[PDB]
Amino acid sequence: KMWNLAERFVAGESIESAIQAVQALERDGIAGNLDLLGEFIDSPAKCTEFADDVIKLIEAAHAAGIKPYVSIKLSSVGQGKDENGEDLGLTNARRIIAKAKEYGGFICLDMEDHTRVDVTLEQFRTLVGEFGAEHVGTVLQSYLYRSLGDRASLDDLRPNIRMVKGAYLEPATVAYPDKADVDQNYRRLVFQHLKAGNYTNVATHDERIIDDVKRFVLAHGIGKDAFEFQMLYGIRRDLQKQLAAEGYRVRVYLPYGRDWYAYFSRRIAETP
Ligand SMILES: Cc1cc2c(cc1C)N(C[C@H](O)[C@H](O)[C@H](O)COP(=O)(O)OP(=O)(O)OC[C@H]1O[C@@H](n3cnc4c(N)ncnc43)[C@H](O)[C@@H]1O)c1[nH]c(=O)[nH]c(=O)c1N2
């Protein structure tokens, strides 16, 4: 009965359970951000199957009257694999974004470990050019030394970017080892993106940072339509509700699927 526990953080194992969970968030004035979980994705066949499963999700969400908003890791759809002379991740991402876009939806390219940052930001730029900044977004992680520079380099795209602290175990040659620096850099990324007038998703459960961002938005006259807070399903549900009740946009990341063990284990690891 790991599931009796994991149900807090994972919508369920089916597309149906995910849609039901988005519908519940929506009834509470909160948007959803769907994440298909998968573990075996280590072959071009399986990466493309995964992409097809994300597309089936997008169709089901659209059928259920939900604007598709889905986050994917490009490695899961073939990033770094060549199929007939083109990168499989880019090929599959195009299929997935085109389908989301047809239904007025949006895809976020999540950011993986440091080895995939350059390719992801190159691919993101390509895809923004093909589909528009209103339909594809990405993520920057405040623990990396390179992130402030990366954010500034994307300003010409006026891009939708989610700021996160960072999820991977990265060495000190790549990521600030001091949590104080990670947190200060997080504010810097959020504030520079907001000052540039780009749509910003403030993905954090750190209430001190949440309060400071509220302060910043107030002091700078930034509208509550210009950014949103984002949280993982099941973490600080009280803040999710409170921020929605105070007029902020809140969008909750909802993982689903049969392969939930690793995701669930990371939620357990991060228990305060
Ligand atoms: C919507 C969204 C989307 C993503 C990500 C986060 C979110 C919210 N992340 C993960 C992110 O990098 C970061 O690891 C987590 O958000 C945790 O960091 P915090 O900002 O919550 O602060 P921090 O880790 O400091 O935690 C702050 C507080 O939040 C609460 N909290 C956090 N985790 C909890 C838990 N498991 N159980 C109970 N309470 C908990 C506790 O109160 C804790 O003190 C991510 N990372 C990445 O590298 N690439 C990505 O694409 C993404 N995508």
Commentary on this structure:
- Its cofactor is FAD.
- It catalyses: L-proline + a quinone = (S)-1-pyrroline-5-carboxylate + a quinol + H(+).
- GO terms for molecular function: FAD binding; proline dehydrogenase activity.
- This protein is of the alpha/beta class and 272 residues long.
- It has a single domain, classed as TIM Barrel, CATH 3.20.20.220.
- It has helices at 3-6, 15-27, 44-63, 88-102, 117-131, 147-153, 179-195, 207-219, 237-245, 261-269, and strands at residues 31-36, 69-72, 82-83, 86-87, 106-109, 136-141, 161-164, 200-203, 227-232, 250-256.
- The chain has an 8-stranded parallel β-sheet.
- It binds dihydroflavine-adenine dinucleotide.
- The site of dihydroflavine-adenine dinucleotide (FDA) has 22 residues, from strand 6 and strand 9.
- Dihydroflavine-adenine dinucleotide binds next to strand 6 and strand 9.
Features:
alpha/beta; eight-stranded parallel β-sheet; 272 residues; binds dihydroflavine-adenine dinucleotide; beta8-alpha8-barrel; oxidoreductase
